[PDB]
């Protein structure tokens, strides 16, 4: 039942079944060859009466050892090499999917969790394929094979092992479960106490000022004391568990080996048959260890194969069907548009606007008021809940998302840069050709060239986490040059959120104007004073919009709706409004 | 050499040496009793000729097993119980030290690192005391004892083990070191690749907008490929290492047990002497495992005992010698005061001021300009580099730090609250008696009572990390009530840094005035407009101070020094200065 999705998943990578089957066959043959070794030692030891020592018998044991090792090396390489092919194919599929999942997917799901899945689930599956299946089969063949060979030479001494091994395990298991429960509880109390100490130490500033020396000592002392009480409770458990595990193991060993010796010493058995018996006991206990591990692995494996298949079945973004845009700067109408993540809550509704060729329109309104939805609707970062976005007089969902994203340009504050060269960032993702003589003809414009020429290298710095740190103004100027190299007909601007420094800001404002000249521009911001020059402002009413005039008209005949943001500004200052 | 600081450290806890010595003696006796068991099994097995089976011989083995387990339970409890006493004593010493280390210590050293030390070093030392020393001694006695008993019954078969065991180890060790090196390199490349994927995923916003789909796919594909290449290099190592470990172990076992059988089968040995030989081999291999672990533990232990002793030898704050203050609101002079963390850089120098009875003085100046040093000097959070702080006409270092911290009061923005009750916070650390009828007579003042009475409980909420989250204004009002319950003669105020919300701020300003009335107040802040009412402002010049007048005098005859902060404000707004 559960093995049909795993198999299907493995088949997605078009694996070579012959090579895996042959490797498994070699493992099975390696285990069967490992059951000859104790019979050949018994034949050698039984044949040592009057000390003949036939050299062919000790040489044949070496030939069988080198043959077992040669086949085990081949099977182990083949299994690992194909597992490495299978896992590589899985990761390539998962990565090609992730890069095409709609930007909605990363809005709902954590990027780190997705990375964690593609890096761990594939690993689990690998581990299952390369080691655990072959380990499990070989262990079963080794265990049942060894017991069958033992019962055919001396059934009394294996009947004893088939009582001693289960009765020893029936004791050690519960005693071990009980032990581990106490280890977890002391770990948790250790954690609680470290947490408590951590929490007191950064507030030492007040503790000192308030004369709370004995008070904070005493609350820490109660933690020392609760840890000590659990430590004594662990001591009273570990003192019974330790001696009892050693008592059981040695009583099992003495019982098995002493009855082996008491058969050889009476004549009911030979010296070489006892030798074979010990040599097989090691071939019972260890693979029995192996097989047990298979099942936990199998559970984890199922969960992984559930998550990966989940990703690789999800919807991907249809970026490449529709028309091609001609004369793209034409009027963007919204007419009866609407949105919500689910129809339970319509985040934006009954909206209409026009956005005008070569002008600016500014989305500015209350913090947390949903205003970011209209911006994400206009850049196609989100599909409307059945209401029209229209360019000129054609519904915008007509044009291909490639032919849309090509005639849009995009810039933000708070941006990092792509790990790569500075010329690679100044021309990122655009498949048109570029040249040294024009890539800096886009960079002199944002004042990027005459900044970049002062760095240790004029085309690289390993920008981002590897290279030197850059200030927000430098990062913005690098973004503004990329958009001048695309020469988009429409521009989407994310001017600021959170908080920022005003250092060099007037030179950054003079850098920004370059890009927005003579093309249609849509801006989103957190304050009115940054937006005083705009040809239409849009105020946001937690689901609906008004304003639809100059900044001054908001200051003249809007009133209370300016006051619902301007009061929070006037708690700090008049923000250069001077009114 | 290295054992003299550990021992001294252990002696600091006044441990019971008799009980540890007796537990170690019991462990040694338990190991010697564990060397009888295989001789008694040999006597039983050798005595089984003609199958007499004397019941006293199989009963005596059980009596020796229950005696070994009884003494092992007692020794194991005693060792763990005394280790739990020793570690508890260590932690109590370390915590009583930390709480008294000067506030300078936590300024240089990370609190988390100190917690980590007191929670891990003590543990390491515990582990060494309870398990590793006894484990090491018992292993040596078990190993040398078992080998000495083997050589006295059959020296040929132990001479073989004393060649087989070292020659097997001389192979497995290097092959294992080499194996682990490849496992580390693949871990690192896995980490590098996850890091790379992580770094791409939160920037999916641009990747989509820029048409960088094949570009970001290909950079990820190169990571899949480098991981696959290292995976194949690991496969070519694991394929030789696995077979070779199994080949060696089985060749060692076959050689030892086959020569055991070939002695019994020729008559050079008995069936029971072979049984004893196997039973002792297990008493050689496992404690040899144990002893090896002792040394790594010993190294770690030394490092721990080095850090803990370091803490427990450090200087602690002399909080309780000097005079007692009378009439504490008198003039605080600074005259030729100076400071620095080291004399290499004098952070503040040649400073003089007066701070005046029942007035306000405000420390306001450039960000990162060192101004926080003068505030920390005035509250005695730091000693001057030989220049006088003086109250009335007495040097302030005359009064006890208790009798100082009692006549000071202290409040800050950005503060958390002590984990505890709300009545416990409103009266924190003060050793004077309090009553329900007066603790709320301090709380009605900050408007704290009529806020607290609306919570689910009127005296508790488990405030901080356990309970409900509180806003900055509520936390400030709780702090302001504590200072009214102390009724300090002098007040130290940290008004704001970083960033804050203006929500309810005018009601918080009306709450703050309550505390500062009719007592001397020192304030530190980040903007001039918050401080317009102050009777003296102090501007800071990266080592020296001026201003020494009203806010308006800074606005009238200071000029360029107001401009060196006011310009950065005027990039945003005039900040209600209206000039």
Residue numbers in the entry:
A (entry chain A), B (entry chain B): 10 to 588
Anything the authors wrote about it?
pmcATP-binding cassette (ABC) transporters are ubiquitous membrane proteins that couple the energy of ATP binding and hydrolysis to the translocation of a wide variety of molecules across biological membranes. Here, we investigated whether a large separation of the nucleotide-binding domains is required for the transport cycle of BmrA, a homodimeric multidrug ABC transporter from Bacillus subtilis. Upon ATP binding, the NBDs engage in a transient tight dimer where the two nucleotides are sandwiched between the Walker A motif from one NBD and the ABC signature motif from the other NBD, thereby generating the OF conformation that is prone to drug release.
We then introduced the A582C mutation into a cysteine-less mutant of BmrA replacing the single native cysteine at position 436 by a serine. We determined by cryo-EM the structure of the oxidized A582C mutant at 3.14 Å resolution. Consistent with its ability to transport drugs, the mutant displays a canonical IF conformation similar to that seen in related multidrug ABC transporters from the type IV subfamily. Interestingly a clear density bridging the two monomers is visible at the lower part of the two NBDs. This allows us to build the disulfide bond between the two Cys582 residues. As both were solved at identical resolution, it is presumably the cross-link bridge between the two monomers that rigidifies the C-terminal region of the mutant transporter. This allows us to build an additional ten residues in the oxidized C436S/A582C mutant structure. The transmembrane helices are perfectly superposed (rmsd of 0.45 Å over 549 residues) while the NBDs are slightly less separated in the mutant structure. We found that the presence of the disulfide bond between the NBDs did not prevent the ATPase activity nor the transport of drugs, demonstrating that a large separation of the NBDs is not mandatory for the transport function.
